């Protein structure tokens, strides 16, 4: 019963910036480590990175490909992500999927997904 | 890491089990996720930890396999179990995603 | 690899417990990384610590070394706030070569942690018997 | 505890090797039970030793220990036998006070066995470099 | 300045906590001024010590000086009165010349403010993190 | 707590001066984080180091020190790089005990930071005149 | 900054090479960091260490130190053990002044980084040649 | 090879300041040889020299060694003649044996300067920050 | 302390925001005070820590101001907001008090 609703939204030509948003109410929401994952037409899913909990937006991680170019941000309302983001359309080209990550024995897996956006 | 998967394309379609395989470049533990890509564009978690399953799983659905070669059986496959399936690895901090085998 | 937070389910006697843990840092004076149990008070913690050593001129061997400590508290008689009440204590240690390959060192990992399932030491350990 | 044969599958980096081990009696002069591995030559077998430790007027509490020891073999040219080249570690001890009680025990053996399965450990241990 | 009641508002944790101190007096034999909570026992206060001492011919630096104690309280087992459980100590000290202005010295004051209120110390002193 | 840069706005005696500071790494030999002026030359920066300490059988409780200095430059003639003609000092020791909670800790940063604001210090540390 | 994996890439004579270094955490004694290479038997990785002189308020001289080493191994005719026939070593030093800028640093370290891919250096490394 | 004149390019650290050096001869008692920048009052001149040990055919060790230095200018109060304050050092040394092959030392040499352009030695040397 | 202002008679009646200042001889460490002494005799508190409100300030009035510079804005002007305010210091024991700057 839990669902994922904020989108934002934007089609942002090459050289803008874009703010995106996911709301996700229920399941403790400060306990979880959140991740974007994104999926390019054709190939394959790309990851993008996870932020921590600590009752505090204090410290995340990114990949190799999207690093200084974007940021997330752990807004503790509720339950509010942020994926601002710089320099889109020249590989940015996805459908865009915040997930959930719990763990297992210190492994990431990604059990609650939900689509928001595409760009 | 390089999740790589290798018929790409399985065909079947009723009946009998199928056996949709991935292989890891280095070993990772039975550190390794499945995941089903609906085209509607919802994606579902299946098995965390090869062989263990999500709450909302009938266990039609069932994985094995440990070192670098795992997989994932479907007995008594039926029309609402046809999709893209990827698998990932959750042992190293990159988290490579998987190629993909469309049903 | 990373200090990350570990969670580990499935734990305890009848497996239905969890137990996550959360990093606490690495020290510099020692080289020993932490983890512990989400808290207020530092001495009701369930704790744990991991450093591997290198070869000195004095020891020629890596070490690797695992500490696990679980307190126990209680609210006295006449008293307000907890304390501890008695420790639980586990200390792992592997000592290798500089030519041991990687194959030989995950088999002595997994086969220490497929000797701490099995009923000998279950019965040697929850029990308290020795092999007899 | 009944000193029987013990089976260890699936254990290994890759998870298909097993392991069977035969019991050696226990020693009548400190009480420790042993095991080797089945087939054997020995001197050149891998090895798992268990005792368990009772309170005196020396030490106050309990202590489980577990001492494994597996060595490398390289037939040398020229020889009949082969010999013993380097050797790995492994040894585990558990100290517990006498007010303890089960659950607790089983907590710690059961943490230290799932803690053995973790990247953290897998990273510890394999590759020989400690968390950052 | 002058000994005043210092009230201080939006203080704990969450900010939403108030402390009023009372003055004390100044002892004659070491030069401190004093400011302590209001209560009939003594040993239950929250005290404040500041005190600063000028150049003699042994040590020729200014010494500002302040200390903080806050004990906390509790009701054992058999027992009516609450005592003492434990102590949170704070003591700072700033050393300056003859020859420095006040510039400098209100830039180490406002400095040292608007570090106690950043997430660095926040980590380090509230959760006992070390900076890593 | 992950070493960033550490913005302080608004300090100074007028409330409009302020600092950025990078972080400097750790010290191997005694677990001392640092921190230090944007720009710089060496030697002539203000520099910041926060260190954080467990108890031993040395020690019973834990403590958290922090250590600020800053010099002043004056250039003198006929010289091209400035000398340090006098240093202003500030540090907090923070002592807590391993049954201190969350909240009391956060309380003594809280009254520390709040008592460094109040006209009782403003008067002691920017004029050096004590309370009466 | 706080050790992290570093990797090193299109090395090597044709440039499509590359390395993947991953930290081994600080000596104590001394101060010097280290990273090294993923791979089976430790002592056939390459290795960097780095060593930067600790920040004081009466450092003269502030040091950088880079120690790089790559063996090469070879399997010998009658032996299980790889061993290392040889070693290529580099040591880097920089020496800079307390007085010293960021410019002046930031230039000597680039300087060297494009002198090393010059025809001066990589026709008197890679070939030996003398400059005449 | 024969000395040239070695332009470098896109040095410092935004990355478009350049260098142009000329040869200076070469040292026939130590066979090293010497470039310099160009500019009046050759005592301000920045200096590369560069020394490769001689190809004999009994010769263990070949030992490569580079060291640059730059001065900086003060036009003091009350001279003519600009002096030098300071100095900025860089000395590089390499170090391959007779049998070592073509590759190890093209990758020895790509290796630092593929090291001198990442973040673990801009933080370390145009900021001084040691690793931790 | 002597909080001289230095306009002493703002004419704005209606719109947009209005700034009223006031200047310490010393520093005085955002120890700032806001009064409103309306003509029929009653004076009320506003603004005490040079941005923090009383309990019943519609936060038309804000505070700003550090060192010993500091404001006072009124957006949105009303009808009920025309009075003469005065400023004064809580830093130091003799609590001077400001002039005065009538509406």
Sequence with gaps: ?119 | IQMTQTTSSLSASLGDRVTITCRASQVISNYLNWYQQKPDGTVKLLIYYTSRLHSGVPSRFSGSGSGTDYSLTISNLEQEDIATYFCQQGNTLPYTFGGGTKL | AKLETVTLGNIGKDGKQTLVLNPRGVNPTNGVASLSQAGAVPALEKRVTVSVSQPSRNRKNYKVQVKIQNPTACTANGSCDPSVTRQAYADVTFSFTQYSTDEERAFVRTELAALLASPLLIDAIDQLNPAY
Excluded: H
């Design chain 1, 1 to 119: 019963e839990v669902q994922l609703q904020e989108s934002g939204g934007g089609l942002v030509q090459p050289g803008g910036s874009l703010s995106l948003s996911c709301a996700a109410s229920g399941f403790t929401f400060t306990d979880y480590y959140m991740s974007w994952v994104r999926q390019p037409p054709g190939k394959a899913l790309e990851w993008l990175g996870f932020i921590r909990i600590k009752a505090n937006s204090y410290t995340t991680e990114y990949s190799a490909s999207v690093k200084g170019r974007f940021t997330i941000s752990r807004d503790n309302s509720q339950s509010i992500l942020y994926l601002q983001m710089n320099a889109l359309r020249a590989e940015d080209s996805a459908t865009y999927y915040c997930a959930r990550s719990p763990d297992y024995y210190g492994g990431y897996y990604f059990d609650y997904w939900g689509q928001v956006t595409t760009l």
